[PDB]
Design an enzyme around this catalytic site. Sequence first.
Site, PDB file in Angstrom:
ATOM      1  CB  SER A 216     -10.550   2.273   7.891  1.00 34.87           C
ATOM      2  OG  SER A 216      -9.479   3.217   7.893  1.00 34.87           O
ATOM      3  CD  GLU A 349      -4.333  -1.073  12.326  1.00 34.15           C
ATOM      4  OE1 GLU A 349      -5.151  -2.122  12.564  1.00 34.15           O
ATOM      5  OE2 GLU A 349      -4.431  -0.620  10.973  1.00 34.15           O
ATOM      6  CG  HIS A 469      -5.304   0.654   8.337  1.00 38.88           C
ATOM      7  ND1 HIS A 469      -5.957   0.307   9.587  1.00 38.88           N
ATOM      8  CD2 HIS A 469      -6.087   1.308   7.736  1.00 38.88           C
ATOM      9  CE1 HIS A 469      -7.125   1.139   9.364  1.00 38.88           C
ATOM     10  NE2 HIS A 469      -7.377   1.750   8.477  1.00 38.88           N
TER      11      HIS A 469
HETATM   12  B1  7NS Z   1      -9.817   4.242   7.265  1.00 41.80           B
HETATM   13  O1  7NS Z   1     -10.915   4.529   6.714  1.00 41.80           O
HETATM   14  C1  7NS Z   1      -8.435   5.313   6.950  1.00 41.80           C
HETATM   15  C2  7NS Z   1      -7.551   5.660   7.713  1.00 41.80           C
HETATM   16  C3  7NS Z   1      -6.551   6.459   7.459  1.00 41.80           C
HETATM   17 BR1  7NS Z   1      -5.259   7.031   8.933  1.00 41.80          BR
HETATM   18  C4  7NS Z   1      -6.229   6.997   6.255  1.00 41.80           C
HETATM   19  C5  7NS Z   1      -7.242   6.456   5.132  1.00 41.80           C
HETATM   20  N1  7NS Z   1      -6.978   7.181   3.738  1.00 41.80           N
HETATM   21  C6  7NS Z   1      -5.610   7.803   3.539  1.00 41.80           C
HETATM   22  C7  7NS Z   1      -5.854   7.973   1.913  1.00 41.80           C
HETATM   23  C8  7NS Z   1      -7.157   7.171   1.654  1.00 41.80           C
HETATM   24  C9  7NS Z   1      -7.724   6.649   2.654  1.00 41.80           C
HETATM   25  C10 7NS Z   1      -8.113   5.427   5.366  1.00 41.80           C
END
Ligand code: 7NS
Length: 568
Positions: A216, A349, A469
């Site tokens: 992420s 995801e 995800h």
């Molecule tokens: B990865 O670090 C990540 C991707 C997305 Br798209 C959204 C998030 N969030 C949203 C709410 C807290 C983390 C993390």
Amino acid sequence: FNVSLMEKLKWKIKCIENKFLNYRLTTNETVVAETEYGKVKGVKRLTVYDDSYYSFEGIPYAQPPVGELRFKAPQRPTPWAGVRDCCNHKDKSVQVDFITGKVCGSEDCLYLSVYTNNLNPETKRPVLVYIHGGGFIIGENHRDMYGPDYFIKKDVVLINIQYRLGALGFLSLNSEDLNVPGNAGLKDQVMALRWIKNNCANFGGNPDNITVFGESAGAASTHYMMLTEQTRGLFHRGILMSGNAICPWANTQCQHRAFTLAKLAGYKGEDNDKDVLEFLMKAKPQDLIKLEEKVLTLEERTNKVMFPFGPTVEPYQTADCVLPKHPREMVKTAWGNSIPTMMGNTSYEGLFFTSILKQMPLLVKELETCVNFVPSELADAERTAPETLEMGAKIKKAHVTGETPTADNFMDLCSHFYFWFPMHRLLQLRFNHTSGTPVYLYRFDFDSEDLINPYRIMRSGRGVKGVSHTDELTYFFWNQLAKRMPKESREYKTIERMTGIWTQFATTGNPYSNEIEGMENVSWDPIEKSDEVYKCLNISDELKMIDVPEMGKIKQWESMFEKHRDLF
Ligand SMILES: *B(O)c1cc(Br)cc(N2CCCC2)c1
């Protein structure tokens, strides 16, 4: 959006269990290692699988970014005589705890942790450096979320870093005199990587064989570390897990939002960078982080800006500048294009957005025209231009399966907007600027609820089928929700497979090994520039090379750039 009382109590109970387990798995075997900055004392710990490892936590890689150092580039830490106690972790960066809803952490957070099953190996070992995700706003290197217990089964050195989050890590002001260009948190990562390069040999690591990986925002970070000139040749392999710097959530021009934050926190005065900075410099850090959720406008939220502060194109150059251009422009010149690279995503995801959808059902109606998901660079400001409606229709035909769009259609679309499409764009750009070193793709497609991690609580994924995800983190890292699994269990086998593949790739730049269970018939070829269709290792109960199922939709998104190829 408050986590249920039920889960809050489960979580409190698990936090207490974690404290006691941590104590129980501590040993009396302390050790001292050398570093450039002085001696560090670590300690052996146990795992629930009856393994053990040496643990050094709270190694500083920069000065505490407090007082006048707030919002500034990190400075090298002060060295010490004597021995620094590294037998305990330090605080995480100031952030909102998503279970409790309360602000936690400290400004004093620039630390890394080092782990290995053998401090004096007979040969120097691959060094894996994990950068955690959390949207650049949450996350830690604490072992209640990122425990090295699985990785230390392998003969590697594993290092987990922290870096500043939120406005404290990513405030950005145009005024060059103020020395707050932005990306302080990415500059934190750079200084951590420099520490690792120069010190990993002290813990048995090979400084000529370093792999950086993250998931992420940690994947976007890894990619940033592969793009910036600041890190040229500091490491030798990269793994991007469900993210990269081209993702729409992974960068934002946030120079105007400092004033907004100041005003949320009580600032009285004009929108002037120096006045705003001085107010922000005096604020309680927890007040600023607590209010960060309020910063984005209705327009920005509509237009899919996810975080108010994040990686940004810096408005002027400095000695520590990390991002002088937009990430796409940076790909065209990136040194990291020429190191062995692995990338991947999970098989559903977008399921990650279940919670947000539950609270805001109206979001599903966005798929009636899909104009809000047209890449911002292409869409008009009101998203009403005939061209924007046309592009949105291409998206709608890609993801809406019936007469009326569904929640699953929405989450499928999210998979592509936030993850698969940025990956495609990166791969195609990279092919025009590389020595030709290989890039390998995986698709994580293993679904279990017998072993989980805390993100499953955040995404309301109890009893929910599909590989979201963050679901793969469970098979890489110990967390306080985990347990000892039977060795013949499909969960345990997946732990072995994932840590094996990552260790194999870290070692050789090639993720294939016939030493991994289920890989006997696997022919894992990297992606070639001439490939019309991407091949990936699909990781489920079986390991199977397949054409990427997402390919058709990926090409449909690409077609929105038909009359705008220079922007693809
Ligand atoms: B990865 O670090 C990540 C991707 C997305 Br798209 C959204 C998030 N969030 C949203 C709410 C807290 C983390 C993390």
